[PDB]
């Protein structure tokens, strides 16, 4: 069904995702953990929002917990650095992603950079959704799990957080391995990310993962159940598109009131297009 | 009512206790945490297994970590928290060094004979501490911002004599002033390994154990408290024989893996009186 260039679009796709993602995210170590006016009353209900407990097993069968503390003045920014790790760690993995990809490559440097500047927490959360348990809440990275809290309303008060509404939502598709990688290269071929110049090439670039994306859909999936697919996948990234602005907001509150992001983080925001951008433009620059 | 000396042997155990027993573990810091021969060994394995216990730590701004034990997969992993189990003997030890060092009738025993009396009553004393923080409807023992809680297997706990020991000393419900007098009476055993003073340091024992009997007879509702003091003095019996049975458990494991600190190779056979025991004979002149 599919046409030959198709074919071998997705066979690249998908020997990229697995050669660069760290499922088991066995190699991910070195980490930061938990040591043993209005705009602080803003940044407090951000962080509430999404409280999730940490858990570590050990390769011997033992478990280590930690529940973060229950308040909301400093005990809040408590799991920031260890995330800040965990996302530096998930985006080198999506650098070398979009290395391996012949038609990332090819463009220039500069768009190289924006590209993955304006996509870095986007790939990143496509990434968590295909580790996101929705029975129990729970994000299982390997040896790291990481399990929301409960609340009172339940379901119905964290499912008002549009990031974890997308990662329900998403979830509830039950997208095979093909469409998340083909969401993946759609939203990192975004012709209208700041700083881009070769918008022409990006956008048709874009446009044949898309037209890929559909063709895959008509040809594995006939049931009711994935009637307009294609559609619901491509309103789910630009509701992933909206989400990233309004969590970089976020983040950039945050980081004025308790400075935590990595550096290569300060990159991806704003905390001469490769000078300002010395860490992401060494990674292109090396080999995989 | 008391004696005028078995007031004041009180009174002396009494400060003793409170200047040297850290009840709420506030000065326990820089531990070890665990991270994140076939027939010797086989021996080893049921050794540690009886009384697992997962580790809890509670931060000062309300967080909690929790620590639990893997299962036994025949490896060093059984071996996970020996390190910190050894740094809280440690700790524990020198408060009983410190104890014994403000009672008047220890300073005047020769220090050949305090190292041997601490050396024999160094586990026991710190089981009897550590009974006064035992939590015994949680089966957890509360050591200020720590916490050790019996992992579940409540009848087939009661098999290994070291959790029936602390079941059953808890449910006595006994005074301070019991678990400091029963604290005396474990030290001045006379028939400690090395003790050369046996009439002085048995004499002493028996006046610690009248001023006890003497204590439960006018301190406690008569007769229903009539066997409480025999009771006790068959508890100190037990302690004794769980000291033996797990310091041979103890020297089993250091054969294999050593984890034991400096102070803790001092106070079992692990390598003059003074001279084998030189951080034990630098703690007890200071
Ligand atoms: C494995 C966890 C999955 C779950 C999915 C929502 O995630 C969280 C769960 C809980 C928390 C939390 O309890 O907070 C303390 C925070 C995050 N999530 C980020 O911490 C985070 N996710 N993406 N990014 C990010 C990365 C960037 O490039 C490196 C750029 C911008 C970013 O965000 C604006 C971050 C900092
Ligand atoms: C802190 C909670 C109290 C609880 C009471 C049973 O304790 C444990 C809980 C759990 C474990 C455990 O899960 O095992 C890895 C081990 C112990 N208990 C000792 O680790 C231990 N208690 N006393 N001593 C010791 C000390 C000596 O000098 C002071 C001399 C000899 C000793 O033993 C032969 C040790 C090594």
New interface residues.
Partial sequence: GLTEEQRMMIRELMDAQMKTFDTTFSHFKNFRL???AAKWSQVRKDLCSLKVSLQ?R?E????????????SGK?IF?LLPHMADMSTYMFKGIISFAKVISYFRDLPIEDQISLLKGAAFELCQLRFNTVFNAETGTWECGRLSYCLEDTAGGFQQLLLEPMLKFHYMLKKLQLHEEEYVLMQAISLFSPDRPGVLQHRVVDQLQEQFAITLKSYIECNRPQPAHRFLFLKIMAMLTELRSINAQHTQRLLRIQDIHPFATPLMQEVFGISLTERHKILHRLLQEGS
């Fill in positions: 938990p040591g043993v570590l050990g011997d069968g033992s478990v280590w917990n930690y529940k973060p503390p229950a308040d005990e408590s």
